[PDB]
């Protein structure tokens, strides 16, 4: 909605003026945004993962997919095909509105916020931040709360470098201490 049209004017025009792009297709596009909740303590009871799924469904607009374990590990008492994590991959306009609520509303509420350090890019412009407790989104009632139950949001941009993706996310006024 808002951040899409603000992108389509200002971000493409500024990454045009300060990065040498003969074509507009070279400008990095934030493509998808996934919220992952690596619950993990549902080796004992899966009531907890069942609550965490509805917590993610309240945060985003999509019903989250439950992720079963890939290989069996006896270090953490997990079994093959045990549902141990939860995820949402949200792309398109719903991702744009989640990006609205993340920047304009959510990141002021991280409760002694000092600015997300920009060195969390992995090598090709994809960002990853970790939200430590779930109540930073105002969709949670906070009269109901049970556990802290954080998550991590990773943003996939089509940038190839860290500086191009950093300038892309900084063009949408990321905090960036």
């Amino acid at each position: 909605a808002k951040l899409h049209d603000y992108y389509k004017d200002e971000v493409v025009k500024k990454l045009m003026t300060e990065f040498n792009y003969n074509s507009v297709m070279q400008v990095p596009r934030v493509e998808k945004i996934t919220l992952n909740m690596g619950v993990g303590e549902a080796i004992a009871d899966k009531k907890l993962l069942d609550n965490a799924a509805a917590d993610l469904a309240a945060i985003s607009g999509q019903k989250p997919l439950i992720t079963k374990a890939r290989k069996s590990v006896a270090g953490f008492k997990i079994r093959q095909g045990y549902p141990i994590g939860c995820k949402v991959t949200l792309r398109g306009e719903r991702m744009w509105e989640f990006f609205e609520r993340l920047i304009t509303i959510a990141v002021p509420r991280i409760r002694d916020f000092r600015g997300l350090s920009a060195k969390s890019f992995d090598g090709r412009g994809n960002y990853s931040m970790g939200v430590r407790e779930q109540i930073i989104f105002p969709e949670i009632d906070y009269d109901k709360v049970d556990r802290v139950r954080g998550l991590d949001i990773t943003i996939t941009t089509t940038a190839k470098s860290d500086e191009e993706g950093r300038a892309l996310l900084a063009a949408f006024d990321f905090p960036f201490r």
Partner: peptide
Amino acid sequence: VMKIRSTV
């Protein structure tokens, strides 16, 4: 004031 598509 902000119009926002949300879930609250």
